[PDB]
Amino acid sequence: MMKGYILLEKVNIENANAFNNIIVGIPAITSFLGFARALERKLNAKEIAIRINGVGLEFHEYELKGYKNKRGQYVTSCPLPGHIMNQAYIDLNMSFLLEVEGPHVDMSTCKSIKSTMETLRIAGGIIRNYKKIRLIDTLADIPYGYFLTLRQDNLNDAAGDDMLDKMIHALQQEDTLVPIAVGFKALSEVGHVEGQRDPEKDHCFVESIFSLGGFECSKILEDINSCLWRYKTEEGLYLCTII
Amino acid sequence: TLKSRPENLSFARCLNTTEAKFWQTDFLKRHTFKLPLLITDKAVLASKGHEMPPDKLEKEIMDPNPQKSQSCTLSTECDTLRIDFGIKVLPVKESMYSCSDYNYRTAIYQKIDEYIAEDGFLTLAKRYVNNIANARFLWRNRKGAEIIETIVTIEDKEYPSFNSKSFNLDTFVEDNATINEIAQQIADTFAGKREYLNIYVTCFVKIGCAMEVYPSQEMTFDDDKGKKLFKFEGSAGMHSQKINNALRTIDTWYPDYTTYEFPIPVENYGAARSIGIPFRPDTKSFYKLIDRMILKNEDLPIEDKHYVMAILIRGGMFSKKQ
Amino acid sequence: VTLKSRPENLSFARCLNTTEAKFWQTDFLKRHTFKLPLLITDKAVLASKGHEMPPDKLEKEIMDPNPQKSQSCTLSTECDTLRIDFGIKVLPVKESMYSCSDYNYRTAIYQKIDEYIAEDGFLTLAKRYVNNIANARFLWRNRKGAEIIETIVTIEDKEYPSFNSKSFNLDTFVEDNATINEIAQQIADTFAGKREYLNIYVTCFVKIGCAMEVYPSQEMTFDDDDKGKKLFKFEGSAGMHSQKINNALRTIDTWYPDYTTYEFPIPVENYGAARSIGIPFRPDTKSFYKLIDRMILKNEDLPIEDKHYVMAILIRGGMFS
Amino acid sequence: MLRNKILAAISQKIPEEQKINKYIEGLFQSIDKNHLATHVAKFTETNSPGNIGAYDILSSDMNCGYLDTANAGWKEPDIVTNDAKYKRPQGFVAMTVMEHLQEDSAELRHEMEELTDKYDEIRDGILNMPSMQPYRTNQFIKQVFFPVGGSYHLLSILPSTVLNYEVSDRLYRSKIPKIRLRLLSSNAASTTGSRLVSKNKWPLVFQALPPKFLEKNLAKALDKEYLLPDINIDELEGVDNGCLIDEALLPLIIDEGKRKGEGNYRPRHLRDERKEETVQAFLDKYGYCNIPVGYEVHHIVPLSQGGADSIKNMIMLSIEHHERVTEAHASYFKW
């Protein structure tokens, strides 16, 4: 049960779903950690037996599909359907840091991740290219990027009546704060409603929950867990956090 | 025995095409020169040129308004456009991202395995990379040129360059050994014998000094009312969707071909966007062919199988009506 | 096989695709050995209110003259001749229908183009287009004063005999000169599909004088005030819009109803509209939006003047249902 | 005003009192048809068979963390139809008037008492309208797997339309919330029965993109790109076997690097790495089996000046000659 950190450097996602209802741009972090559970699901489909517990996101470069107008407000661009439902897309040169624990962490499982990730998509976006997949030992072994930490303390200690009002007040104080999508809150009790993806899984209608996150520099960040995301499932409150 | 189609069946794309990135080079020195090609802006004036009744024409002829129109053009010094795009292909048996009934999944696995030992996705691969060979991924950029050279690289091996202005767009050729070897590569990586194949294609087109390069127009859905092109990383490029639709025009089996004699891109009801009437309305479609393959086990003519396993390579939401 | 209506998507592409017209400055005795860059300069103008006003606020107009930063161009106190370089790519008319919904109209338009191809194979129109090349109307207001205007027309590394542009009048078209006819024959061939493309590079030398003023193509300013003459800049140098150059090389319509009375060619447009003259010259009848419905939907033989028009707007494009 | 709006709602050849007489009949004819919801699944995909939706007023209001529809502004409820023919109640909700029916005000009671009386059970009707209940998940609602413990649980995401309306209004009031990207991607033929998307077809949501110096410009793309000398070494007479034996062709070797090196400086962080596989393959270009004695490699285009670690870029210089050209590239580019 050795624990190791695997860095996927310069992953170029093209046309990831930037639209997340009230949030357009940074995709839902549930996409970026369901990439980890898909990359573990297909690895335990093979004989690798890796259980990924946390994933840290470093957003190195970004581009939103659309054009800047005269005023400054963007206009998003979408594919032409074969009635256009609300949708928008983003390209992300971002690097993953995977906390991996299991039988053993070695360079051969980096080659296995190298083989496996080239059939995967992150947030519905294809992978053009990758720089390197390397096991890191310290914060120094991480290139210059900007991690996405969950600054929930800024949203909690914010002046307002409702928490939206608090978020509007929070984005009007610090500028590096970005409102990000984290998890899904239950809207109904679980059960076998008809018309599912896979009939055997229990199914629950949900609603996306949202929070406020911040960008922390590479050699300014303290610790590695402080930038690692994890899945937590309270009863009716599925969500990914930083603890 | 099955009774219907599933409720959440969704294949994914088996021929993922990355976004093209346009560059401007000179033919004599094209293996080194690679200057960025940017999206410049110009001011056009509205011509007001639609049909309108002959009484009111003095109103909308004498009040024009300027519209800022993004236009892409080459430099005076450089005379070739360099379209660089990528391709990632995955096997179709694994492209079934979502499925509901396991009996259906076993049936479609068995039918794909039945085609896989019959032809083994060769003719599909010939046509898909033949569209690379004709360079239809230069939609209106190829209506006049001299030597449109397509150079295709697999892994680290650069396959021989192909002069696209010797292959007709309406006649698919199956004799070329480069096309045969590359189609065997895409066929074996489409079968499941391989699990991934990257294909990087660089195309050089001699449109001439200072002439116009046409990139993909961004859907503004906003008002402006101006031609706005796609600026990828500050440079021109095609919307990858267009690239996949260009490589996808392989259907020469649509009903009533002897009369029309032109290949159309594969969709469900055979709806190409040049001809308004759907070419494949009923008793030749996707939905009434898997019903006529899986729901009622019966062998189909091999052209039908080529079509339906072409759109199965496309991906989309093949499902029930609910 | 009867034809009922016109297609929902009926879009032709440009069969006469012009580049931008890049400006340079040179001396006329050594034009072939000179090519200095022409740059857009910046000047302050003061608002001289010359629009109409009742005698209420003219004192307020003279009280506060707001200056405007206008971009204008003077060559140099040394150069003596404009050098326009611009390229044109003529493509076959048949391989330019960008969309046609119905296929019956498509084969009707292909049969109709071939009918014209048999009788006068785009030679009249080509001669007129190259006659529009010859008289040097590329210079819209730059032509207004000169002593020698010389246009050289290179076709695929073959420098042709150079043209005198002031000897050819703006109001009559010449069918006699050998160079204009053989260049028009190459363009007639390119229109056919007998040749799939032709790149034509035209260089115009106009000797307006020393340190005189050029007149580049204006550009629309930003909507948030800043009203001023913002000229076009192509590659750190002045340039004209391909729309101006095509409208210059599209003034081939002399077959308009009110000709014997106006006797001046207008530019080819869908209802015969000249923006500087007014009163649309080809309204109701003699309008593509009725003539090609009289030519394709119905099936009579139009006279060759209306046949000259109805397939001369087909190099331009832009229709619908 | 309000009675004037009710009269202007139905303007037929029939009298205005008969117009009120039929409009109030439609009012107590369409509340049973239309339903009330906070989330409509047709907002994700218009072609969603059946009215799939949920009410989130039941969940409490918390100030502990995060953001949900219950934990938000959430002032106007969202009235939802199925067919437009059996639907016109939004005239008496918007004509806000929804606040007037929400705040127990009796001036709307006076207006409806002037109209056809019957205000109180109409108030009951738009406050006991059938609350939208989810009973089916269709392929067009976004169904996503998510783990609980070690087993995945199917989560069908029903989009929050009420939150969308709340943010669009508050962001306009915010004026400068920094995150203000407008989605103008919906047309007028919205068969989604929600009132709030009919009020705003173009929602105003947050722009949540990384801080605005990580956006890829043309320069960033050029930085990643590397340059290669045009020199065709495979012939280049004076260079035999791959080695710059002749010193006459030397000045071209500095000039090609200086031409593709001038104003091409690139900090080490963006420079190509000196992989050993490139000099290994360049040794396998022609025999050698190691780097030859006294000859050693040189990127014709200086690495620092945007060079690649490719096969077509590198060369073998002599040691004294390498000293000459490295003094040249030290002086010219000013390292």
Author numbering:
A (entry chain H): 1 to 82, 95 to 255
B (entry chain A): 11 to 233, 235 to 333
C (entry chain B): 10 to 330
D (entry chain G): 1 to 95, 102 to 341
The authors write:
Recently, a newly identified type I-F variant, known as the Cas8-HNH system, was discovered to lack the Cas3 helicase-nuclease gene in its CRISPR loci. Instead, an HNH nuclease domain is naturally fused with one of the Cascade backbone components, Cas8, generating double-strand breaks in target DNA molecules. The RNP complex displays an overall G-shaped architecture, comprising single copies of Cas5, Cas6, and Cas8-HNH subunits, six copies of Cas7 molecules, and a crRNA molecule. To elucidate the molecular mechanisms of target DNA cleavage by the type I-F Cas8-HNH system, we reconstituted the Cascade complex and obtained multiple cryo-EM structures representing the target-free, partial R-loop, full R-loop and ssDNA-bound states.
Utilizing single-particle cryo-electron microscopy, we solved the structure of the Cascade-crRNA ribonucleoprotein (RNP) complex at a resolution of 3.6 Å. Six Cas7 subunits interlock with each other in a head-to-tail manner and wrap the crRNA, forming the main backbone of the G-shaped complex, reminiscent of the typical type I-F system. The 3′-stem loop of crRNA is capped by Cas6 protein at the head of the RNP complex, while the Cas5 subunit, along with the N-terminal domain (NTD) of Cas8-HNH protein, recognizes the 5′-handle of the crRNA, masking the tail of the backbone. The C-terminal HNH domain of Cas8-HNH protein, which occupies the HB domain of Cas8 protein in the canonical type I-F system, is located at the center of the G-shaped surveillance complex. Analysis of the protein surface potential showed a small positively charged binding groove on the HNH domain, which may be responsible for the target DNA binding. In the target-free state, the Cas6 subunit contacts with the HNH nuclease domain. In particular, Asp252 of the HNH domain forms salt bridges with Arg125 on the Cas6 protein. Ser324 and Tyr301 of the HNH domain are hydrogen bonded with the Gln136 and Lys133 from Cas6 protein, respectively. Apart from the polar interactions, Val299 of the HNH domain makes hydrophobic contact with Phe48 of Cas6. Intriguingly, in target-free and partial R-loop states, the C-terminal helix of the HNH domain clashes sterically with the PAM-distal end of the target strand (TS), particularly the nucleotide at 31′-32′ position.
